[PDB]
Design a protein around this ligand. Sequence first.
Ligand code: FMN
Ligand code: SF4
Ligand code: SF4
Ligand code: SF4
Ligand code: SF4
Ligand code: SF4
Ligand code: FES
Ligand code: FES
Lengths: 230, 28, 54, 117, 207, 108, 427
Amino acid sequence: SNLIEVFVDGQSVMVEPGTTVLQACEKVGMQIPRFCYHERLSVAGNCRMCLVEIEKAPKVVAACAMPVMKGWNILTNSEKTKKAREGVMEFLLANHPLDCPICDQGGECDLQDQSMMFGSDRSRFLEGKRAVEDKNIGPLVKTIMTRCIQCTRCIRFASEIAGVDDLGTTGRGNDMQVGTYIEKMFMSELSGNIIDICPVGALTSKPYAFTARPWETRKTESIDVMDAVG
Amino acid sequence: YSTYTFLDLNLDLSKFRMPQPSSGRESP
Amino acid sequence: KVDDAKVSPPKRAEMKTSMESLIHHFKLYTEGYQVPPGATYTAIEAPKGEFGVY
Amino acid sequence: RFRGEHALRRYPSGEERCIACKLCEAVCPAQAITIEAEPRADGSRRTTRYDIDMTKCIYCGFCQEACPVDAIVEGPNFEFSTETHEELLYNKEKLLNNGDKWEAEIAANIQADYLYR
Amino acid sequence: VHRDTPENNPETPFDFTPENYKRIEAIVKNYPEGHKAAAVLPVLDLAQRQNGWLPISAMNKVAEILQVPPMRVYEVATFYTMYNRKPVGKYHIQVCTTTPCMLRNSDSILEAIQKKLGIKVGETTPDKLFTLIEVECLGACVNAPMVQINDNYYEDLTPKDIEEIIDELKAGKIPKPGPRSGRFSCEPAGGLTSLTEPPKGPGFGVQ
Amino acid sequence: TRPTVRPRNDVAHKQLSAFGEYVAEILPKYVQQVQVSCFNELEICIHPDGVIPVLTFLRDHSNAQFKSLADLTAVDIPTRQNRFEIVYNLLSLRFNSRIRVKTYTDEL
Amino acid sequence: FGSLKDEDRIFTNLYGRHDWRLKGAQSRGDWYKTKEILLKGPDWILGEVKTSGLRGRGGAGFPTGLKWSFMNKPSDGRPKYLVVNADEGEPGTCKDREIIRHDPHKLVEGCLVGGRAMGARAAYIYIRGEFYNEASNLQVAIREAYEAGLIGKNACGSGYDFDVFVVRGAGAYICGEETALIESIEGKQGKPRLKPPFPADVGVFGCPTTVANVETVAVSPTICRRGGAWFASFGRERNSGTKLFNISGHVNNPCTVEEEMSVPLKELIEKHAGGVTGGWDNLLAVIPGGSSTPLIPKSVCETVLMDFDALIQAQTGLGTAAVIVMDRSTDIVKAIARLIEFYKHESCGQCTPCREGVDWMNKVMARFVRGDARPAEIDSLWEISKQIEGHTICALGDGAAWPVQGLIRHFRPELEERMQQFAQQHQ
Ligand SMILES: Cc1cc2nc3c(=O)[nH]c(=O)nc-3n(C[C@H](O)[C@H](O)[C@H](O)COP(=O)(O)O)c2cc1C
Ligand code: SF4
Ligand code: SF4
Ligand code: SF4
Ligand code: SF4
Ligand code: SF4
Ligand code: FES
Ligand code: FES
């Protein structure tokens, strides 16, 4: 009664008519690597770090946005997929300058816990690396835009939830920045909450700016009372 | 040949003769 | 060194210019390798007798 | 390649070569090192407290080999042995001198040794 | 070029001629209602026309007309090419340089301008009226290294007569935007003739 | 794959399948599981009853010698509901092999 | 294919060029029988083109006959439109804009007669604004007829007639895809969507649209006016029709001609009119597609007929319908870089393979040409090109590598010796 069976890696699993690959292949306990996809936001397609390899068809699809039809064989781990996820994450390390000693996310970043486990080994480039320039927003968000893997996860969020529509995408070709065309500072509530979003260290917090790196701390859960919702 | 002046091109015969449009809504 | 570079650090010429040579030199000096589960044993001939590691 | 009393170099006109990236701290087996950064006035980051305990340090050669900006360096001087354990604990501003007392020793070893590793 | 504005003309000010508010009635009439919300491509460009390059207060103006947050404009003007955000000259000239236009040596219709016109590439003439660029994919490669001026194009050119096309323009004379030499329409020549005929006595597929 | 990856050897992995097949054959009162470690070593999961018994069979025989006791040890695992573990480890001098004998327990 | 041609008579699918540019009764050819066509059931037109089965001029396969009788069979709540590229993206195409320049009266019919098959509502066209003069005149051509009462809203004789709303772009490639054009018809920035939403006939303006091409909707009325049994004339049992080629870059008189399929390139290039460079000993290094196909050397190309699937037999086919060649002085390595230096400027820039992946080549291509550091690179640079295929959304990536993918094929040494030419030089 309204569900499909589809074999993920040779194992049957039920899925409502209209869940994507990624929401199926999560049900059996795998992460297709993720960059532009995020639950609470919307979805677009511009990372290209999830390429699942469908069974018996020469093209390679993308497991973010595309439905799942009567059962494919959704083949995560083969010699075809592993030919892509290694071939994208050597691209987005083309320009990503040689920070990590001092990029304040240097203990969680996702150009780090992907690109050891999944993807490449050493580099062949050998010369290059645009460096654009930063600006400022407010006395919270600190902005070095030299990095920006350009998921566009900070942008779909402004027009989304916190309703302030400002941030934009300015440019064409190898060069497009993100931050605002004019000089407008961007300030509101919940918009100090961006710096969970951005998967690499573009947007990092001001007061905390340089104090500790996150293997040393101690997570002791708590509750915030200044106000109603807690 | 007429560098400016798209006017009557857009607004003369087109303006009256582009019916209805209904085009619906989409309020949204 | 072993070549594959996930288990070996790179040289000081390589970690110091290209990109891939930090993220495997800067995650290799905090956590370690990732060595699969499962038990071993082994043995050698040390000058006075055997030596184990289990 | 000898190992011994510690130092912190600085480039030509001095930058206190250490950037406080918190590594020579995190590979340390004995856990001697202790580091507290906090953003210096201009906005370039540096340290405040840096303390190598000289009793705990087991003389690895793990803190000479993890520093990417190539600051902290085991000196080749066995000058040691003072009479009070209140002492051997080091602060930052004991180290730098102890590493600017000879840099004619140090700066001429690495350029023999750095071509191998 | 850089894509940030150093607060030039936040209030320039700028406005549309009351002769133009009667056309914007017609443009929006094209589209369906409630999605209208972007006519921006003609409407933002018409504004370039009234002025000749649009300052930042032009980008802010149409938003008050079109009720879209004016980062949904500054974006669209930084994507396309035709719009000029910075100031320009009286004639903004193009030299097509691409594989076909290279094969016929577009460099011919290019430099020998520096020896004539006496300015570098990408730089307006010291006064106003002239600047220089090059672009790709316009019109025909069937012609010579064709050249664009502003609203027109000069097909099938050569270093000899383009000396004129600029120099007669410096005088204020406008020399016929067409492939001045060879064949006027770019004709086959080799079966151009054909003797046009009515369509073979229709009533054909009447079935 | 060859240059940096440890080359395997099959022969050692065929026999220690056999010779361990049938020590689940001739002492089924005790042995409750057996397997082959991918590196060509064996692990015999044995109930706590046979300890003196099973070894004694391993103590002497003409098909399994295992005279040399090398390493006794332990491991202690919470959320195994029977905490500790033993692991005996025995070398049979004639036949050149290692076969380890795992026996669980509790404190009490 | 018959006689290995592809001839040209005054019997062709295009009426006139130098005769009459302005309006009228369509003195002979056009606007002939209408009320009889439209008054018969719409699906009579559907599949009646199958007698021809036009592959389509959009630079691809997928015969135009299917997609219109394809979905957009039903209708429910929301109108359907027509978006027909007038744009040219490929360098040296030039086929377009000749149709519009001297004979616009055809296509306004081409939609009206065509749009009835879609059951559509309105008619949009689209034109790169970079053509200011010629594109400006269509409105007159619209008016000079439409004003007479030839179109809309009943015109003529049916209860179904609707007008055509021109628009314009600026720096577009956007015709580089459908599902981009239908986005920048709207006024967003133009980043083409993902290909399978709901492919291009579900997700649309507000509501399903179909993206046609110029001579796909241009030649439809005349092929439904007569058809046959002459609809299939030249070309084998697979591809059939007569399309336009526009020769460029070496010839006596590079100019368009109507030529049917299966024509060999050795007679066609030489003809219309001459071969003016060396018909041979000029080495004839040729490019089948405009930008979408790599080189062919002096090999079987010259006998290889221009039929589509005949080209897939070679290492690359071409749907673009254009020709660029070379003789001697043009250094290919020098002459292919300014085909790549082009790609870097026309790309959207969403996807990680396209952006940041084309420059990796374009930054190195200025090494080879200049001549510069050692081989074994070539072996890598091939893998990069092999590494962008399923990885990009639009075809611009799949149309990004082929020139370089097919340069490493067919010419080995020209590079190998030049890296020496600077190697010996360094010495
Ligand atoms: C870079 C690029 C440029 C293109 N330019 C055009 C164009 O100028 N005109 C066109 O009709 N299609 C162009 N296309 C291809 C479109 O896919 C095509 O128009 C569309 O598929 C319609 O095909 P059809 O109408 O023949 O079925 C271009 C594609 C690319 C990648
Ligand atoms: S930011 Fe992300 S990627 Fe850039 S250095 Fe720090 S971690 Fe490595
Ligand atoms: S913040 Fe960094 S990641 Fe998040 S969108 Fe802007 S650039 Fe892409
Ligand atoms: S030396 Fe290397 S490790 Fe010791 S602090 Fe300075 S940077 Fe961090
Ligand atoms: S010297 Fe040996 S012990 Fe002291 S810190 Fe460096 S590594 Fe840890
Ligand atoms: S290639 Fe990738 S980036 Fe360039 S246009 Fe097609 S999709 Fe957008
Ligand atoms: S994760 Fe694949 S589209 Fe963003
Ligand atoms: S591309 Fe240069 S003129 Fe067509």
